[PDB]
Every structure is written in structure tokens, then in C-alpha cells.
Design a protein around this ligand. Structure first.
Ligand SMILES: Nc1ncnc2c1ncn2[C@@H]1O[C@H](COP(=O)(O)OP(=O)(O)O)[C@@H](O)[C@H]1O
Ligand SMILES: Nc1ncnc2c1ncn2[C@@H]1O[C@H](COP(=O)(O)OP(=O)(O)O)[C@@H](O)[C@H]1O
Ligand SMILES: C[S@](=O)(CC[C@H](N)C(=O)O)=NP(=O)(O)O
Ligand SMILES: C[S@](=O)(CC[C@H](N)C(=O)O)=NP(=O)(O)O
Ligand SMILES: [Mg+2]
Ligand SMILES: [Mg+2]
Ligand SMILES: [Mg+2]
Ligand SMILES: [Mg+2]
Ligand SMILES: [Mg+2]
Ligand SMILES: [Mg+2]
Ligand SMILES: [Mg+2]
Ligand SMILES: [Mg+2]
Ligand SMILES: [Mg+2]
Ligand SMILES: [Mg+2]
Lengths: 443, 443
């Protein structure tokens, strides 16, 4: 069910592939890659491809720059928009040190580490169905983006109110040709916003999917004279974009979250799992919402969470339980946004979830109600805690949580905190057009 | 005949449609749809598939916000401007709740509910032939509509006075290749105004016929560098657009409105029905004219109604009985405008008419003169009421009518009152440039 070096060797000759892209993911969720001519295949498969690690965000220092790429052969895919003499294929890679030690800073591998912990606890797969929503801006004279959305449409609109109809069709086409099992395509709430959904996959595969997804969304958009962006809240007073993380544990072909006995079809594994996410949600939101701009979307009134609670069929809370049951039984962690590093965010959610199982915690009361229309002490009554309000308050929540530190390991944890703290302090000393428009004449 | 799943399956295979487009309508009459690839065909046909009802206007709240779609299979249609590999079929859907119940808030479901009460009183089909007039404006360079109209032509004008022949011929062509029975196209009275008529059909498919028609006109208008608008009165001083509702009852392929033996040629069933339409007109005007702007159409001098009355061959009253008889025999409610939600409006007029049959009401006598040149005191004489003049009074007339509260059921009634009252209380507060032009120098 895994591919061998000779599997890959045959694909390269069958489809007459000309170039290889070796791709991997830094600490910011940003995909990086070098292209080699397929004449270098044997170097690729014997794990002898090198790059400057010091030139990558959350990696090594300049005095130990050299690092290697190790291709995960299962990640093979060919880019259905490439020619015959320019056919390009891809391998996603894990990062290693010169000595053959896998890198403590690799985000993909760190998720592979946390998934071995769920396995020793008796679960065969951790499935994630991501929901990355995006905005489409128009490009100008000289190719750079503008602030003019591509339409003034809204949820489930059709053409011409929704003008990214063709562009979404082109993204489904190339994606389907890449082995994506697409599920739905539609205009989202906010003007210019779009959603394309695809079937869930096992943890490592799902993240690889997100990275591919972004990759295809952005380039096809450019071919439609549009600029795509996964920024959390591009604009005040409209819905932001969130990368909902639908998750579930399988004991093999069977969904450990589903109960065919009860009226709400949830097992107590699932209740325990949701318990852990809720307990540790403060500690992991810096990682699921790692930009300053991520907290301009965690504001009430736009179907994004602000308050740690769970409920079914309810889109105001941090955890919605969608109505589907059966193999589709899942918890939806709505706080995640598309700027998150998927590998790290899923590591976060998984180990928080595994915290609830290993510690057999009982879940709080479902908040079956519109949490926005609740006031500070009406929710303080039922024990509903807030998520961090700023990126600075999110990191502090991180420094004091013990689970996110285990889910990330010491390197990523420190490199993440060190970067984002510098990030905050550049922001914190910016003077906004807001401050000037409100304060330059008045005072 | 009536299509069944495997009928659906075979058409999908035999035609290689790659994409389903599932559509439903919100309270404001606006079409809503999601694209899903044919991968998901079986998830569609098992009514297994969902959307967010709190982001549909006039539907559910965010706490209870998960809803499903049941496709009406008889609505299968392949878009004749989608080639292979990008070929889209459509299915109109009904809307269901998480408990498997139809949604009280579905406007289409509702028309179906009322049509059931029509089968009670012994009628097989309620046919409607709609007449959705529209305007075409010129786009500017960056794609947005301007206030320059496409021609300056009149009723029945030719090219080059009429510069919409070519936009209309393309509309007519796509429409026939979607199965429409087109009956005429021509320039309408106002400059830039156009009409395309088509055969009547049963109530549901006719409202479906209107939604498709609207979507196909706006699409093709863009292809021609135009903006189609179904706004009732886009410009002062020249006719508005109406959506004439031509209706009749059938006792099984027999025009129940046609009496072959009498001179006028109407059965007493047709008379009773008009009595009910005429009695309840004020109560259903808000739903037939839901815009502030709807009421700048409903003003004398423009071939559009403003007084509750009925006449044959006569184009001033609310209701006109056109000369044609036989199976063409119909009443024409001329108040309807194209911003009206088709399903709701038809539900409203269907029950008003039913109100008159069941109670065997008797018809006001016809007003066989140009009822725009009758003085308020001359009209009060014969006992002729006025239509509501503002959306606010129309809402007042609606809150005080019992037939309309039962045509919509409480959810649609309540949702529409609420939404439109708010739409008014913004309008009533804005300062018109009319006001600043007459008053700002004089005072
Ligand atoms: N058992 C499961 N575990 C994790 N994700 C799942 C499971 N079943 C379905 N999903 C995922 O949840 C996603 C949610 O799809 P979507 O239609 O976007 O739901 P909504 O938009 O209503 O939250 C799908 O992408 C699917 O792959
Ligand atoms: N029995 C009927 N019931 C409802 N509509 C009908 C019937 N017979 C004809 N019609 C419809 O009336 C419409 C005529 O519109 P049109 O020719 O524009 O009339 P007008 O003379 O009012 O412009 C068509 O949509 C046609 O299908
Ligand atoms: C209507 S929405 O509910 C959009 C939510 C918002 N944009 C956010 O996640 O921040 N999401 P979904 O795809 O789950 O229906
Ligand atoms: C000549 S007109 O009579 C124009 C009516 C106008 N546009 C309105 O109903 O507002 N309508 P029709 O197509 O029924 O002849
Ligand atoms: Mg070697
Ligand atoms: Mg291709
Ligand atoms: Mg979704
Ligand atoms: Mg969404
Ligand atoms: Mg979601
Ligand atoms: Mg199923
Ligand atoms: Mg006509
Ligand atoms: Mg007309
Ligand atoms: Mg007419
Ligand atoms: Mg008789």
C-alpha cells in the first residue's frame, strides 16, 4: 500500500516525467521546494539531496547549514498542467540532519512522532478533513494584488453575483486529476470568499493535502487574473476565513467516535477526546491562530469561535459536532485558520485529545444556544472560558500550557515562540491608519 | 415521466456530466446552489448532504443551523453551454431539518403544501405563465454596471433602435436548449426594456421556470457586455418591469376557467377565484412587491396597477382578463413584480383564489375604463380600493390579513415581516438627493 523505489522508477518512465519537485514545509506552514531534472532520480531516492537549512525559518543556524531531504514515496503525484517535455512530478520530503538524525524541527515528522503515541493507545488512524476557505482579489496593471474583491457575492450565490465560479471549477479540475476526492464547491459568506471541500484523510495525508490545496488554489487563481489569499481576516466587518479541522479516531475501518446505540451516537472516547481539546484550547490557539491578524477574526458575530465550549449543529462555539453520524461522525474544531501550520496544528489537537483519553476526563455541558448573545457573566455562570484575545496573550497561554510543549517538542516550541514574539513586537509598535484618523485632529 | 434515481444514474453515465449543481431558493427569491462532482452522486440521491442554514436569509438560527437537501429528481437539466469535462447538470432541491422533516421555511416546499389544499377542492393543476420583463444597462470597463441604458427604443422596435435583438436571441437559444417553450421576445415600452415569454406550466415548475429564466438572462447579458436587472422601477419617468402572473385552474387537462357557452367565456369558478384575488390583494401586496422600489412602479400612468379592480382587455387594473379564450383562458395579476419570490407570490395568489372558491364569493363588477383617469372620489363611488403605496403600508396590510398568514405559514410570514420592516426603517432614514436638490438652497 506504500510505494517502493522501483515503483517510483517505473512511474518516471511510464509517464515520461522530466523534472522532480522535492517539497517540504517550514515552521510557518510555507511550502518550499527545489526542482531537479529527473536525471537526478537516483540521488533523490538514496536521500542525498541537500539544501541550506539556515535559510529556512524554523531550522538550523548558519554554522550547521547543511541538511538533507528524504522523499516520502507515497506522496508521489504528477502536476496535470505540465507538458510532455516539461512534465513535473512531486515528492514531499522529511528533513534530516547531516548525521542521519531526523530533524527535531521538521513539522511533518513531528506530527509523525505524535501519531505513534495515539497508536500505542490502540487507535489505527487519526483522520482529518480540512475546510480551507479563501478570498480572491483582483490583480492590477503590473500583476500585484489590489484590495478589490472579485465579487460582492455571499453564501451559496451563483453567477454573476458569484464571479469566481469559473476559477473554482478550474481548481476542482486540476485537483481531481491529482487524486483529490473533491466533495463540494461554493461561494462563501463574505464577498469574494470561496470554499472547496475534499474527503478526509489520515493525519499525515490530510496535511499534505492542505499544502497541495493552497499550492493549486494560488497558481490557478493567478491564471484567472486573481490573487488568492488564506489570510484569516483580510477585512473588517465581514466573515473571516477559517480552516475548520474535522477529526476522528479510528480503531481500524471503524469510527471510534460513533455509537450505534445512543441517541446522539457519540462514544465516550469521543466525549473524552472533546474534553481534552476544550481543556487545552487556550494552550494551542497560538498555533492554530499564529498571525496577529488571526485574532481580528476571533471576534463574535462571524461564525468563528471566541469562547471555549462545544455543541451540536451549532456554529457559534469552539467545537461544533456536525449532525452526520456513522462513519462521518466527527468533531469540528472551528478555531483553526488557514495560516496555521497544519502538521503542528493537528499535532496540537491530537495530543490535547489524547490528553482527555489518557486522563479519562468528562466533557462539560453542551452549550446548545447562541454563545454570541451571551454576556460576560452569563457565560461566567456556566463556566465558559474565552480564547486568547491577542497573539501576545496566546503565546503566554502557550508558555503556561504543558500539552502544547509535548505536542511540539523543544525545538519547534522554542522556535515558534521566539519568532512570534518578535512578530508581535513589530506589530505592537506600528501606528495604524486607525490611530491617526481617530487621534491626529481630535488630540 | 417522473424520474427515479436509476433514471438519474443512467443520464449521468450516458451524458458524462461531471458536476451536479444543487439549487434551492431563499426567502428573498434568490437562487442558491453548491457544485459537487459526480463522485458524490449517491450522497445526493440518498438526501445525505448538508449546508449552513444560518447563512441563508429567512431560514434557521446559528444554534440550529445544519440543514439537508432533498433533490426533486424531475428537475434534471444539463446546461447547454457546458461542454464535456466541465459539463454541469442541475437539480432543484427541497430543504429538510436534521430530524428528517421538511423545513417550514422552504418557500418551494410551501407552494407544494398549498397545492395540496388545491387538490382537496378538486383541481389537478394550477398553471402559471409568468412575464418577467427586464432592463439592460451598459457595463463600464472594470465590469460594474452604469446608468446608461442599452438602447433608446420602444415597444416592438427593431434594430438599430432596438439594440437587444442579439442579446435576446442568445437568451432564447440557451433557454430552448434547456427545454423552455419560448413564445415571444421583443423590446418593451421603456427604453432599455425587454420581454421574453414562455408557455405556462404547473405552479412548481413555473416558479422553477422563473428562477432559471432569471439566472439565464443575467448570465447571457454579461456575455454581451450588459447588466440585466429585474429591479421593478430602475428609472423614474418611464415604465417599470412587472412580472405578470397569468394563472388558471385545470380539472385534468381541461381549462377550468373556460366556459364555452357564455359570451364572456368565464366559468363561475374563474369568477370566484378573481373574487378571492380581489378581496385579498392588499394582504398579499408586500410579498408580490417586496422592495421599497416596487412601490415606485405601482403609480398611475404606466400600464401597471395601483387600484384593486378587474377588467377584460384592459391594462390599467390590478387584474386583466386577456381576450384569448379556449385553453388560453386566464386571469392576469399585474401587480407581481420580478423582485417577487416566485414560490411565495404564487402560494399567496393561489390561496387568495382558493379563498373565493371555497366561500363562493361574488365578483365586483368589472371596471371597463381607464381607471387612471378616475378621481379618488370617483373611484370611492364604485367602491374601488387602492393598493398599498409604501412597503410600510403594505406590511401593515399584511399584518392585518389572515389568508396570507396561511399561504406562507408562520415561519415565512414572520421571517418576511421581520426582514422587510427592517429593510424599510433604513430607507425611511436616508436623505434622498431629491431632497437635497429641491431644499438645500431654497432653505
Ligand atoms: N470521520 C471523519 N473524520 C474527520 N473528518 C471527516 C469525517 N467524516 C467527514 N469528515 C470531513 O468533514 C469535512 C466537512 O465537510 P463540510 O461539508 O465542509 O462540512 P461543514 O462545512 O458543514 O462543516 C469533509 O471534508 C469530510 O472529509
Ligand atoms: N391557461 C393559462 N394559464 C396561465 N397562463 C397562460 C394560459 N394560457 C396562456 N398562458 C400564458 O400567458 C402568457 C402570455 O403572456 P403574453 O403573451 O406576454 O401576454 P400579454 O398579452 O399579457 O403580454 C404565456 O406565458 C402563456 O403561457
Ligand atoms: C458559514 S462557515 O460556517 C464560515 C465560518 C467562518 N468563515 C470562519 O471559520 O471563520 N463554515 P462551514 O464551511 O463549516 O459551513
Ligand atoms: C405593455 S405591458 O402591458 C408593460 C407593463 C409594464 N412594463 C409593467 O407592468 O410595469 N405588459 P404586457 O406584456 O402584458 O403587454
Ligand atoms: Mg548513497
Ligand atoms: Mg489537464
Ligand atoms: Mg463547509
Ligand atoms: Mg465554510
Ligand atoms: Mg466546517
Ligand atoms: Mg452514507
Ligand atoms: Mg407580454
Ligand atoms: Mg409586458
Ligand atoms: Mg402581460
Ligand atoms: Mg355558466
Amino acid at each position: 500500500r506504500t510505494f517502493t523505489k522501483e515503483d517510483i522508477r517505473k512511474f518516471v518512465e511510464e509517464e515520461n516525467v522530466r523534472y522532480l519537485r522535492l517539497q517540504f514545509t517550514d515552521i510557518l506552514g510555507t511550502i518550499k521546494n527545489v526542482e531537479v531534472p529527473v536525471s537526478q532520480l537516483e540521488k533523490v531516492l538514496d536521500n542525498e539531496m541537500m539544501f541550506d537549512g539556515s535559510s529556512i525559518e524554523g531550522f538550523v543556524r548558519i554554522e550547521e547549514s547543511d541538511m538533507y531531504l528524504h522523499p516520502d514515496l507515497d506522496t508521489w503525484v504528477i502536476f496535470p498542467w505540465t507538458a510532455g517535455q516539461g512534465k513535473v512530478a512531486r515528492l514531499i520530503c522529511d528533513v534530516y540532519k547531516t548525521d542521519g538524525t531526523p530533524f527535531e524541527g521538521d513539522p511533518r515528522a513531528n506530527l509523525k512522532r505524535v501519531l505513534k503515541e495515539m497508536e500505542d493507545l490502540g487507535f489505527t488512524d487519526f483522520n482529518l478533513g480540512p475546510e480551507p476557505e479563501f478570498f480572491l482579489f483582483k490583480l492590477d496593471e503590473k500583476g500585484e494584488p489590489t484590495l478589490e474583491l472579485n465579487d460582492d457575492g455571499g453564501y451559496f450565490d451563483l453567477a454573476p453575483t458569484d464571479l469566481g465560479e469559473n476559477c473554482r471549477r478550474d481548481i476542482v479540475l486540476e485537483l481531481e486529476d491529482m487524486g483529490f476526492d473533491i466533495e463540494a464547491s461554493h461561494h462563501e459568506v463574505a464577498p469574494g470568499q470561496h470554499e472547496i471541500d475534499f474527503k478526509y484523510a489520515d493525519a499525515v495525508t490530510a496535511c499534505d493535502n492542505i499544502q497541495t490545496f493552497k499550492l493549486v488554489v494560488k497558481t490557478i487563481a493567478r491564471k484567472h487574473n486573481l490573487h488568492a489569499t488564506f489570510m484569516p481576516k483580510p477585512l473588517f466587518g465581514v466573515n473571516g476565513s477559517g480552516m475548520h479541522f474535522n477529526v476522528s479516531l479510528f480503531k481500524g475501518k471503524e469510527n471510534a467516535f460513533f455509537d450505534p446505540n445512543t441517541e446522539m451516537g457519540l462514544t465516550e472516547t469521543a466525549y473524552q477526546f472533546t474534553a481534552g481539546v476544550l481543556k487545552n484550547a487556550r494552550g494551542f490557539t497560538a498555533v492554530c491562530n499564529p498571525l496577529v491578524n488571526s485574532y481580528k477574526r476571533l471576534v463574535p458575530g462571524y461564525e468563528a469561535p471566541c469562547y471555549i465550549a462545544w455543541s451540536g449543529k451549532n456554529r457559534s462555539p469552539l467545537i461544533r459536532v456536525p449532525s452526520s453520524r456513522g462513519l462521518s461522525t466527527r468533531i469540528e474544531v472551528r478555531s483553526v485558520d488557514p495560516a496555521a501550520n497544519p502538521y503542528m496544528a493537528l499535532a496540537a489537537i491530537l495530543e490535547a485529545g489524547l490528553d482527555g483519553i489518557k486522563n479519562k476526563l468528562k466533557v462539560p455541558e453542551p452549550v446548545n444556544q447562541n454563545i454570541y448573545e451571551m454576556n460576560r457573566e452569563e457565560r461566567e455562570a456556566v463556566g465558559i472560558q474565552d480564547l486568547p484575545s491577542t497573539l501576545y496573550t496566546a503565546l503566554k497561554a502557550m508558555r503556561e500550557n504543558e500539552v502544547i510543549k509535548k505536542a511540539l517538542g523543544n525545538h519547534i516550541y522554542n522556535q515558534f515562540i521566539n519568532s512570534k514574539s518578535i512578530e508581535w513586537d513589530y506589530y505592537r509598535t506600528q501606528v495604524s491608519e486607525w490611530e491617526r484618523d481617530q487621534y491626529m485632529k481630535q488630540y
